[model samples]
Target: QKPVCLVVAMTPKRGIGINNGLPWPHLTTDFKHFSRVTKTTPEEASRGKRFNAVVMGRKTWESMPRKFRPLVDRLNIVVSSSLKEEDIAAEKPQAEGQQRVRVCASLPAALSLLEEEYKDSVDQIFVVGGAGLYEAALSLGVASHLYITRVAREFPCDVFFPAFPGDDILSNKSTAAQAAAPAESVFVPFCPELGREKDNEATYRPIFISKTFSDNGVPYDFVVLEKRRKTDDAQAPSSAAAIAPVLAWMDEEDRKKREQKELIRAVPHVHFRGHEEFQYLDLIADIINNGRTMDDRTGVGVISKFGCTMRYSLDQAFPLLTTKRVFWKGVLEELLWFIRGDTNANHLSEKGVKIWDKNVTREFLDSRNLPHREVGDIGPGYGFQWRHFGAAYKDMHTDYTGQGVDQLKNVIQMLRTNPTDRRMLMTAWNPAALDEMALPPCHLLCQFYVNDQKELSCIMYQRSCDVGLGVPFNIASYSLLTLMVAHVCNLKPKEFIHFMGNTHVYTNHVEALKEQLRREPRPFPIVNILNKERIKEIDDFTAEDFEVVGYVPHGRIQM
Candidate 1:
């Protein structure tokens, strides 16, 4: 994917344009900065060999003068809802190799074409233009650097630069068309040299820089907002980076196939570059690179994308992110309840876990409550749909041992006995029982992978994932399940593959996610299972059975 950046000049009030044109008188220095940043290329003489792409809304495209229509040395992509191919062709007829000012239907569409057509030849993708386009781009969370010229005085302009995460603005913008001052955008007061405003960095460090320019006595500073990946410089975790290399593990088959009758134990983590607990940081980086913004089911909206896959290793401490403490208690509680063939929520309540409390609270239970269940009982959710899926359901209190296909039991059996079965899988999205369940499983399916070396791994397909909320939950939960199954079946757990559709972060949770993303990842705390062998059946496990040694998480992320 190509790197994306933003270039703009706005007034002190965040105003960028007025009446379809530049609002303020041109600052030669600011213009120079914008031109240099957007057009500057590699150090080699290959500077002009490739072209950078500039994406802008239709209004910005039209606002520029006809003489400088297709700005020199750049591939101009104009996003227009109405502009068609013939219209663009008639406007700017080009030679065979010259593709200047291509008209695209949307921002993402322009990017898609640019990546496919000029993947190797394009250097950077810059978003420059109208308020709506900027808001859409900002909401996508893709821009790495902001080349903003901060106009010293305020102007009564019709348009303004949209507020962003580090801007000290927190107000929620409901729609792209009518964007309000987004409270998250970086805005510093000029109190010191120029009194400063919000003191958020006293609580968190700000990703902003400024430069002073004395033009026509207009001594305004050009400000820049940029974010660095957690791995960059001093931002990297001290201990996490120093995590030692792995130790060799002899698998059950490596031992058995070699005919050494001894039972195999799990070895240390594998030696891999990205196996550290901070793998999730790369996921954040992907979102920062390619995610898009659109209104979602809740209509609260989300900066989201489809079809993302992330891998986690069971041996690399735990898959749980060290940046923010994933709720391990709730993770273990849910996994234990699901695999055990127990569909009841009361058991979890008795155990003091309320992750399901939101779905089973008094308000929802009174509406589409299950056949038989009282307060906080999720009737046929993951637990029921997983445990007793195709079976019968009377109440949470009733027990139906052999009603449906014992998928979980069959997995253990197949792994223990048939070891080579390729179809070892469990699915909860029963076509027959959609109506009876409280909520269909969001973590819809999981399939096991038993490789030749007697290593146990899993490829879980989650149909939907809330990046801020459910991703961490599903990650640790299933990996925990993998380690559990591996222990029970005398195999070594290798990797957990999570392929997901509709990975999203709600607009409401955007700031919270930024906080987590900003925190440098720490060394992972190991998940220690005491007497893992003592657990005979899948359901024979309890909370006391699993232990997470050295949990040095920064925050539990209460939501």
Candidate 2:
């Protein structure tokens, strides 16, 4: 299929245009990148037979000088409520390839025209636009790719691009534009194909342009994003068609049972009321059924139940939720980030864990009254409070080695020197330092206990719990934390208890949680820590040291 791509350059605030024109002065290099991306056709064709079409709004067309309105050497499809081909007839008197200036009342009409009339002739379609056109294109999910120039500087803009996939910014333009554009999409690095001749060293020469470039004193990066298998592709056919013959070849019930049997193997065994994941499911069910609805800080109201507790025995299986997939990498990376007392969101982002992305944006930081902090500097939040409690606050770049009480170090020391100590606890809720934080801690305080038999247990108290998403992640994160602590303390991990003050299901998340409740819980995974002797300190452990086994989970429920 010919990919429909959207191209635009925007500032950090997602400002694309001002006074119906670009917000920033022309950056020669960015324009070149844009021209190269939108104009390059993947295939060879006759003179006027093949072209990459550029679709734009009427205002975008009018924004350009008359001579450049047609945008030479390509088809121009202008979407307008009033303009027609006859209105531009004089401009196209002798227009040959120039006669290709088409007009439509809406973005979808323009796309439909491309499919019906220019399907075989067009190599690709680009929506190069004004705010409304960009918004409409994204809302329709017609654009498969987005070539975004993420400029580091902010600009004064009356017109902003609609928030695309992965952007935490909400559209202030219109109510219909509030939803995230393209329900499923992924941010990817720029890797445009360089079509080349055969019989050379390479059939496809890599475009060696540096992804990051500075132009006119503004630093920016080229971002190539793509929708995850367009909606039409998803609805085309199910794999059940291919699986039917295989099922007919064998007994379906036996196939299902055999698959189940493989995952449920002999292990360090224990019995539970149904499966261990039920505690979580039960909480979600309870909140949905009996909780009271109230407005939340995020403006998305929730059905909340106050004061709830869940206890899990970590002897037999790890308590990673089975109803929906959890991003285990994020869980591990975030915890390790806490262990090292690195309170920067960029660290997690660089490691490909973006759970902190929403909280660390420049806009969000400003909203939290932390304009002095940089974009990713998530002040002394979790890690800082854990490893260095009550330290004088500094930017993420500073090192407070000897400063503050190292609660984590002290807790570990107590675990080793005095196992029976009741003071083996840490808190992230530093009231004095709360204002500097990106967002106050959720899973706040945790205390560790060591039994006479060298068995370690942990209990965490969270003031606010997002039952659907955060709770599952919290359970796995603390469980992993307990496991790591037990390993270092030379003890066996026993029980992990969680106390919740405000357990809630967001009003919008009710349906997804209900779907999660329907799925049968799979066998809980086993996390095995490898190379015990090689790891002496918590900081020494890397992602490769842990191996998870038999983690068959249901499809992820998008919250």
Candidate 3:
């Protein structure tokens, strides 16, 4: 059998496609790499009318562009059980220079056709996608090479590339040593040779063209992993294993270049410290590299640290993360929803922001032993606690207009009447009503500070912080709050400080966060408050009142 090669680009969770289309946006470099690899035939093998063959499933054939149906120069072998050869031929006419497309009943028949009929004409056989074909090929052990473009972000995918075992001999163990080594001890990840600067020139060796590539803000790596063939020796594993130690060193060099070479001065007059976004990025890296592993409430294990702090100066620009695209619409709407004293998740969902959907489900309520509450009732969450703190606990549709202490109103009052007062505190961790809530607040307390410069600063403390997903959103949220409060109180927005008690990266979120750390942070965006005259109070501001300008962050990293 001709050694089969499979090609695909997948997310951290192995999702390849969604509803017959790619889950991600158009990646130009990825497309170029795919085209070059699958279309290129070896010179020696091209003695006659020979070309590389790409075998794909029926669905993949339909998913492809009509212009490249036969995939240009390559012989297209589309496997299908229903369609006959004439059916495909009748569907479309062959173009002038396009190669002939063949249809087989199954993958076995496709291979048989390649082996018996076109054995001399075909140079390399590549299994190009539709999940079924890739899974079948991997399961049969006929696939010798896997060209995986492991995308560093997540997407909503209905089908996934099947899971395969990682290389077993990555430790460079001898035959005798391999026999004695424990199974868990020799466990190295798949494609350990990736992210290196160079590729192996030797035949049948694992080839990684580059460590990382980015197009359209999506970061990915091209990795070609050749399975251990029967003729392979111990020396091959040793060469691959040597590449592992250089990975850390390479990242360090890249970071140094980004910091020194790609510096963006926020102001021309004064040189402040490094970009404030790095403070958050450094915390993410620290938690990933050195934090202790522990169990968590959500059943997802976490690598956690006890404490951390991130300070963002709001005077220069808004602290919305420029490393990854934060959903500013959702952030703004959710904040407005909170400020309006709404406890219902449905309100946010109606505005097309469904971040609160997960927590308001009936299953979540059951888990919290509050099944009596209605769905979408987020019971005394941020909105309720901010507007009506110490009010009588009620369901989502309650009329608590003037029921509670109104911490938000008091904070605003203190800022205007007595700026120097130390009691400008607002808290949501009401022990008296913990049972009434869906989940206890992660970001619980914040104290407003007024400096001698007539600047308004906020220091919010979160008891538990999810560094990957939650922290970025929280940072932007608090910073916006500080900006809004400053605008209403007739003060300048100075700085927003975040203090965390238990900072953690969930085990599943590690790979996605690492991908983010590899990227250089862009300049922070400016938040322009439109219709400043019309916005007299916090309640008067609408979601459309604030516009974020020049937010050129990298692609979204969905964890």
lDDT of each: 0.67, 0.74, 0.76
Question: Which candidate gets the maximum lDDT versus the true structure?
Answer: 3
Count of steric clashes across candidates, in order: 19, 0, 1
lDDT of 3 by residue, 462-542 (tens): 999988788889988889999999999999998899999999989997877767765555546668689999999989999
Model 1 residue 198 CA deviation in Å: 26
Clashing pairs in 2: none
Give stretches of model 1 more than 4 Å off.
Answer: 1-278, 369-373, 556-559
The TM-scores of all predictions, comma-separated, are 0.51, 0.52, 0.53
Error of 3 at 427 (Å): 0.7
Clashing pairs in 3: 195-211
Question: What is candidate 2's CA lDDT for residue 2?
Answer: 63
The better-scoring model by TM-score among 1 and 3 is: 3
Q: Write the per-residue lDDT of candidate 2 for residues 1-559, one digit (tens) a residue.
A: 5678888888756788878778876777888887777677775423346788899998888888776677877788899988888776666453665535899989878888888888888888999997878877765656656776766457799988765543421112233343433342222212212212121111111111122345554545455554542222212357878777887768877667656643311111112334566678778877776689989876899999999999877765677776788889999999998998898889889989999999889899999999999889989999999988999888998897878889988988999899999999999999999999998999999999988889999999999998877988999999999999989888899999999998898989887776666554544666778998998877778888898754556666654
Report the lDDT tens digits of candidate 1 across residue range 247-291.
124354454444643322111111122324335555554554456
lDDT for model 1, please: 0.67
Q: Which candidate, 2 or 3, has the higher lDDT? A: 3
Top-TM-score structure, candidate number: 3
